[PDB]
Amino acid sequence: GMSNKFLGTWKLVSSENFDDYMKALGVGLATRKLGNLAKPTVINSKKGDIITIRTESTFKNTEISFKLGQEFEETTADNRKTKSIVTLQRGSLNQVQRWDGKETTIKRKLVNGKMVAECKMKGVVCTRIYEKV
Ligand SMILES: CCCCCC/C=C\CCCCCCCCCC(=O)O
């Protein structure tokens, strides 16, 4: 199952290519400007088989709760209404979001104690690195 090392509170320390990733998602300029300035805290928790990923920032907060492999309805930070599924693949927690015939993937994995999120949309790849606590 998912490693308990995922669980806890994480702080963004690095973000690479987020602007072009947001452009690929259709996010407008003013929103992208604030999105690029955000340094969110991500809190991963688990209760039973239900996993929760909560994101907190001054600009926007989000929260998703899910069981592995079961599709759920998600509202994203940029207010897309997606159908999403999270799977586990070689220690990588992989989230796929589908809406309006499009899809994007967010793959979260642990690397030397950091959480690395790789966000992909239409060949555009963004990497965000988080530190524990
Ligand atoms: C907290 C989310 C980012 C900052 C606030 C929202 C800013 C722009 C909305 C554009 C969509 C953001 C997609 C979220 C990708 C998060 C990937 C990650 O967890 O590192």
Author numbering: 0 to 132
Original authors' sentences:
P2 is a small 15-kDa protein with a β barrel structure covered by an α-helical lid. P2 belongs to the family of FABPs, and in all crystal structures of human P2, there is a fatty acid inside the β barrel. Recently, three point mutations in the pmp2 gene, coding for the myelin P2 protein, were linked to autosomal dominant CMT1.
I43N and I52T do not alter the main chain conformation, and neither side chain generates steric clashes. These changes from a non-polar to a polar residue do not induce large structural changes in the crystal structure. Nevertheless, the radius of gyration (Rg) and maximum dimension (Dmax) of I43N and T51P slightly deviate from P2wt, while I52T gave similar results. I43N has a Tm at +48 °C and I52T at +52 °C. Therefore, both of these mutants also have decreased thermal stability compared to P2wt. With extended incubation, the Ile mutants slowly lost the turbidity, as opposed to P2wt, hinting at different stability of the proteolipid complex.
